[PDB]
Design a protein around this ligand. Structure first.
Ligand SMILES: O=S1(=O)CCCN1Cc1cccc(F)c1
Ligand SMILES: [Zn+2]
Ligand SMILES: [Zn+2]
Length: 573
């Protein structure tokens, strides 16, 4: 206990010696409380996108998105011995498969520096990250902590609750040095993991689900976990740490210390209004950089789902205890069919789709419930509802349509309710946005829509409008998947590269010559997915779109603009 977290606690106590109140009115039950001390970010509207989406100003599902816990303080029972055994064997086998064609390695100050100078979310708390990285005293702070970790101790690796947990860049660097390889070297690529989709892109996910649908077997299951990060057990963290069994030298020691000192024994600071700072600690649950969180969530989800598959296939009889012959059967299933069973899944962190061998999977719930991965919105022992059609399966907040081009070629396209897409593009985060920076964020949403959602009538029109309203040469930006729309290249050229040239599911590579060759959903199916086609508000907006474009051009001023509206049939004279 205080053995490992004491130093971090001691150091914070001193820095606030004149306010160390041990509140007895502390609300924590499952989080150990240590002490307290004295201390003291809304969604803004993007005006460029809102001025060009007027019909949505009266749609509450869009307008409410711009307005405006008790699951972090929960406990997870210890799994049974049969469950623990199944997890240990599966985890051991899975790190070996992921490691067959990859080599664990340390990520570098050099690589970390480049990532900070290209504005990548690292959950940090010198002003900006940029100025800390170009000064050397910081790296001496990193070195002192680095040397403390090699010694098996920790001083400065403390979480700041805000449920996301920021850290001092020094802690982030040390996490990235030891475990960044999982993301930097694509351990969860589909080629390397079989179930993963890391680096895939939203224009690949529907093709991937259609490929899973082609396997013989049962329904497609897509069960969501209730609060996945809160259900990560200490047994889960131990099975994840076994990646260090594949490491050597410094790296092995540096990685072992991240897992022991910061993952399996955390220290957190949380603001309470009664405003004081609450210094609490817990060994279990997920708390780590969002990028390491993604890869280890993928790993543990792949593990859990292969065990749910083993349960449905009768590989083991009970989670209470695994007979010595069951152990051999589980390991033999893995060697014989493990890679085929991974191929029956698409897993993106806590998000999965599984096409099992048959529907016995639907009621194979004992291992899943006992690992703590309790399903959301369903009674603990009620059998899973499966999907009969890959086009109805939810995955990564989307569903996927099969869309046939006038020339017979087949697109599998990503889709979601259009109110969600318009409502998100109308929101910015943070202060100090110039009109130019607001315009360039609108342009990023517009180009994403032209590439991913070209099949939705309202979005291809609004995307053309925004791109006409923002100066042609201004570069799309974001402050916070592969992002092919982040470019000043012509969007028809990018569309051809993504959907035809580089698309491994498209055998005929004939380029498309104009946007009019590129199809929409059926008119009814566009409505079903939230389109306003057919409403008087929408018809007036489309007819008068040049007036809206000219309003935004007048605000931005006398700049070079291109009219993209004649790329659409109806504006082609
Ligand atoms: O589905 S409907 O509402 C019934 C008539 C066809 N639709 C209207 C419409 C207007 C403008 C463009 C368009 F593709 C379709
Ligand atoms: Zn540390
Ligand atoms: Zn749809």
């Amino acid at each position: 206990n205080l053995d490992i977290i004491g130093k971090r606690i001691e150091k914070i106590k001193q820095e606030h010696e004149t306010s160390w109140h041990y509140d007895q009115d502390h609300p924590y039950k499952t989080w150990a409380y240590h002490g307290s001390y004295e201390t003291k970010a809304s969604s803004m509207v993007n005006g460029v996108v809102r001025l060009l989406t007027k019909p949505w100003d009266i749609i509450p599902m869009v307008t409410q998105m711009a307005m405006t816990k008790e699951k972090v303080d929960t406990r997870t029972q210890e799994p049974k011995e049969g469950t623990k055994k199944l997890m240990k064997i599966t985890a051991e086998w899975l790190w070996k498969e992921l490691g067959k064609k990859k080599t664990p390695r340390m990520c570098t100050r050099e690589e970390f520096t480049r990532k900070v100078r290209s504005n990548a979310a690292l959950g940090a708390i010198w002003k900006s990250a940029r100025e800390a990285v170009e000064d050397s005293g910081f790296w001496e702070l990193v070195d002192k902590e680095r040397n403390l970790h090699l010694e098996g101790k920790c001083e400065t690796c403390v979480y700041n609750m805000m449920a996301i947990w920021y850290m001092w860049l020094g802690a982030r660097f040390l996490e990235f040095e030891a475990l960044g390889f999982l993301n930097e070297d694509h351990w969860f690529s589909r080629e390397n993991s079989l179930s993963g989709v890391e680096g895939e892109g939203l224009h690949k996910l529907g093709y991937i689900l259609r490929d899973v649908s082609k396997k013989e077997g049962g329904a497609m299951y897509a069960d969501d976990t209730a609060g996945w990060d809160t259900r990560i057990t200490l047994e889960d963290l131990k099975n994840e740490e076994m990646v260090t069994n594949h490491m050597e030298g410094e790296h092995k020691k540096l990685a072992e210390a991240i897992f022991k000192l910061t993952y399996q024994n955390k220290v957190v600071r949380v603001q309470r209004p009664t405003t004081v700072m609450d210094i609490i600690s817990r060994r279990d649950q997920r708390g780590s950089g969002q990028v390491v969180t993604y890869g280890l969530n993928t790993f543990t989800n792949m593990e859990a789902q292969l065990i749910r598959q083993m349960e449905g296939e009768g590989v083991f009889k009970s989670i209470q205890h695994l007979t010595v012959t069951e152990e051999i059967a589980v390991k033999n299933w893995l060697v014989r069919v493990g890679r085929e069973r991974l191929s029956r899944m698409a897993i993106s962190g806590d998000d999965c789709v599984v096409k099992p061998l048959d529907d016995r999977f639907a009621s194979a719930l004992t291992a899943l419930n006992d690992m703590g991965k309790v399903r959301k919105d369903i009674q603990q022992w009620e059998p899973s509802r499966g999907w009969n059609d890959w086009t109805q399966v939810p995955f990564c907040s989307h569903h996927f349509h099969e869309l046939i081009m006038k020339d017979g070629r087949v697109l599998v396209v990503p889709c979601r309710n259009q109110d969600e897409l318009i409502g998100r593009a109308r929101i910015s985060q943070g202060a100090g946005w110039s009109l130019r920076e607001t315009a360039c964020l609108g342009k990023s949403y517009a180009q994403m829509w032209s590439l991913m959602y070209f099949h939705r009538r309202d979005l291809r029109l609004a995307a053309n409008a925004i791109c006409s309203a923002v100066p042609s040469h201004w570069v799309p930006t974001s402050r916070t998947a592969t992002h092919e729309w982040m470019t000043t290249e012509d969007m028809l050229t990018v569309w051809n590269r993504v959907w035809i040239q580089e698309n491994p599911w498209m055998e005929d590579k004939t380029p498309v010559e104009s946007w009019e060759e590129i199809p929409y959903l059926g008119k009814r199916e566009d409505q079903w997915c939230g389109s306003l086609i057919g409403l008087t508000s929408r018809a007036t907006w489309a007819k008068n779109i040049q007036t809206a474009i000219n309003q935004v051009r007048s605000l931005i001023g006398n700049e070079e603009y291109t009219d993209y509206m004649p790329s659409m049939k109806r504006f082609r004279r």
